[PDB]
Amino acid sequence: KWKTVSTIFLVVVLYLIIGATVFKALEQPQEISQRTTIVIQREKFLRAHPCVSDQELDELIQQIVAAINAGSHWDLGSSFFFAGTVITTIGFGNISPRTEGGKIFCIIYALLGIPLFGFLLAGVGDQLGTIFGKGIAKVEDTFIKWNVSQTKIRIISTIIFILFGCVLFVALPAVIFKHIEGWSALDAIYFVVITLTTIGFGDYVAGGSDIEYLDFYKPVVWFWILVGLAYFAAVLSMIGDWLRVIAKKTKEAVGEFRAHAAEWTANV
Amino acid sequence: SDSAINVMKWKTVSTIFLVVVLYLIIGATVFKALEQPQEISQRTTIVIQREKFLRAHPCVSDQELDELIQQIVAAINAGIIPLGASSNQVSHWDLGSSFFFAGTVITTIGFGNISPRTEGGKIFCIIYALLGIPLFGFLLAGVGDQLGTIFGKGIAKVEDTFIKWNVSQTKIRIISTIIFILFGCVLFVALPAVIFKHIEGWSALDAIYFVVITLTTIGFGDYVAGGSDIEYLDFYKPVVWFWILVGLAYFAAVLSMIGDWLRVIAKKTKEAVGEFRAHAAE
């Protein structure tokens, strides 16, 4: 009977409107500054090099505009890492197929590989899940007979998951990425989130911009991803549970308010 | 009992792990066979345009050309139009684009054609994702249940007119899943691809490629329905993410049906090797 999706639908729409207004408040200023200071860089180069004329720069730009479509790529290791992006639905896009066949293979490779990877992430999920269950069984005895109650220890135990988790799956890889690709502190944490949330903008990739890295690095990246995906999958599911709790709390909250509001009001 | 099953599970994981590794190696070799030819041709014919413009204009800084290209490469990472004319442009963070950017984030599509450059925009995106991604999941779940039981209406009337004599309900489940994919790929794949073909000017394969990459939430961003500037009625850009909302629910079922098919084929090829290695030509 009750739809109940309508209330969710409008929360998501409003959530997109808020984010939209926040992003164009955060980004359009530095969009202005970049684009205005590029015409300075161009008008600098029309003057500083009279060798190039007004039309001949435009010819060069459009060859780089055509170079956008392509840019060694697709080597023995890169195409291996490309396939990892597809089945995990990360899809950084820094490497994308250009052949008509490459597209069709990728379409078929995704429709069959994405379900395949799901079973691995599920097994790695169970594997990771019961390993942490061994760590908390030791912790759920030593200070659990002592004062604090088990209905409240559920709070202490979940803190240690996120604390110890963001160390291994977020902190350590970001520190490593900071000292290998030379990223900033935020770039590395931004990359970790964008990677393990499967958003994968591709603006930061541990394999692109490829001057220095060895064969001990590019395997550990995807291996980190495999296990890290399982971590956020739990995290992004715990956060969902928090939203389910808050949703029920605020559903009955309007319940009691609109209970007493119409209660006194109806009395004549 | 308690950890006897766990030994039986890491042996399951190890077998899956290697199937995925083999599957990645196969795809790898196929892609670098499909793509690296067209990489070689593009890489060699750009050094021709390189050396063409190295001689033809000697009085340009011969080595600072690369310095200019990289400044344009860095400018490519933003929404630029660096030309002599057309020095006014449109904003990629306008009222509508940032709305569509947020749709990419919570759906974990993330086309990346528009990405935040401010350190604040990054941190908001990080917080916007970790809270928005779970949020969207409930909408897609509700739209999933909503779509699911709407199709349950249409199949209920059809699964009665198809009740002739000697019909087997275990095999009518085969007929019913065909009409799901048939009508499914029409409304959620065929019709939007045909529309994208006539609006974005794409080819037939580009549009179907885009639909898959979008609704499989891979989202390379090499094709985006709202990346160029062509006309965009703005009855169009809302229907795009609205299509995505319901289309994601469709592949979510499809990519789950395919998973079940692989679970069946896994058991069949499990016992197929049992039959083979049990006998071995008697």
Ligand SMILES: CCCCCCCCCCCC
């Ligand atoms: C241009 C037409 C492309 C058709 C691709 C069909 C691929 C079917 C794959 C089925 C995977 C289960």
Ligand SMILES: CCCCCCCCCCCC
């Ligand atoms: C060294 C500076 C790193 C600061 C990273 C800030 C990220 C804020 C995340 C907010 C968590 C809810």
Ligand SMILES: CCCCCCCCCCCC
């Ligand atoms: C019935 C739907 C109401 C759910 C309201 C959820 C509000 C989430 C607040 C998150 C802000 C950080």
Ligand SMILES: CCCCCCCCCCCC
């Ligand atoms: C981003 C915070 C959104 C807050 C929306 C609150 C909506 C209240 C839901 C009431 C449901 C009965």
Ligand SMILES: CCCCCCCC
């Ligand atoms: C690409 C499918 C590999 C099949 C391996 C089967 C091993 C039992």
Ligand SMILES: [K+]
């Ligand atoms: K790019």
Ligand SMILES: [K+]
């Ligand atoms: K994804």
Ligand SMILES: [K+]
């Ligand atoms: K992506």
Ligand SMILES: [K+]
């Ligand atoms: K993605």
Ligand SMILES: [K+]
């Ligand atoms: K991308």
